[PDB]
């Protein structure tokens with residue numbers, strides 16, 4: 001609970017920061033900026049969008065090193081503290 | 094066994110859900126929809142396909158956060174509870 | 187040693203299998219086939235190459251689920267049993 | 280501290296080595312060479328850049344197997360020994 005909540009808030013703030021940056025510096029729509037932020041921090045990287053400016057590339061490097069840690073943390077706790085118990089509870093007939 | 098079976102079923106259902114969504118909203122062939130779902134949840138992300146609609150992008154964001162946890166879980170148990178023993182058994186002359 | 191050797195051989199065989207498949211079914215040069223196999227199993231996925239046939243896509247799905255487990259295993263042991271000690275040994279003045 | 284410092288230096292050197300290689304063999308700007316090195320070793324892989332020469336592809340294969348181990352190590356310690364405590368310290372009213 002309290003741990004998953006913190007991680008949830010930290011993830012939300014991280015994605016908000018990305019959305020604001022890419023819509024500003026790279027000129028993306030806010031929706032596309034959020035899309036790029038997620039596709040980046042989860043390391044999926046389709047490359048349908050990518051930073052065209054040097055500022056954009058430099059920020060993204062730092063965004064990645066800082067962002068991956070907490071994003072996968074959230075993903076991990078979400079799966080281990082939320083999804084796991086639920087699946088088990090559904091396996092009791 | 095019982096753990097790997099559950100994870101196997103959960104993975105199958107997850108991929109089925111993706112196949113139905115992308116063939117519907119993004120208009121992909123069912124085979125290409127399954128292909129995108131896998132390439133997404135394993136975080137490979139070639140970008141040969143990517144969602145063009147806003148609905149598609151929003152769903153994929155949620156699909157990723159929810160899907161990665163179980164997909165890598167399956168991958169992990171598959172390697173640790175199935176592949177590992179087999180390799181060891183083949184190393185006894 | 188014996189563990190890292192096994193993992194090394196298993197990785198080599200896996201990459202050889204990929205090289206043969208993609209040069210055959212997708213018609214890539216052997217070098218490009220090996221390149222795609224690695225870029226796939228390490229989950230990097232540039233998408234400079236991607237399978238164009240349905241056979242190619244179906245095989246790759248299976249290749250991914252089976253291959254990621256051992257490839258990251260090798261990567262892990264390589265870093266924990268080989269790179270780690272070496273760095274420490276270089277930190278003794 | 281001493282552990283995070285070492286990992287920090289090892290990461291810096293790894294990225295420097297990549298920058299020099301890609302600007303030399305693939306003819307990228309130094310900034311784009313660093314960009315590719317990071318996007319590669321964190322496994323994001325946008326594919327906005329990718330090696331066009333066989334030398335480039337062969338080196339990158341080796342760069343990946345060697346580089347991922349330490350890069351994610353740094354990312355891990357950064358998140359567990361630096362980001363984690365800080366967030367907790369900010370949660371004390």
Ligand SMILES: [K+]
Nearest residue numbers: 044137230323
């Ligand atoms: K990727």
Ligand SMILES: [K+]
Nearest residue numbers: 045138231324
């Ligand atoms: K990618």
Ligand SMILES: [K+]
Nearest residue numbers: 046139232325
């Ligand atoms: K890509």
Ligand SMILES: [K+]
Nearest residue numbers: 043136229322
């Ligand atoms: K990845």
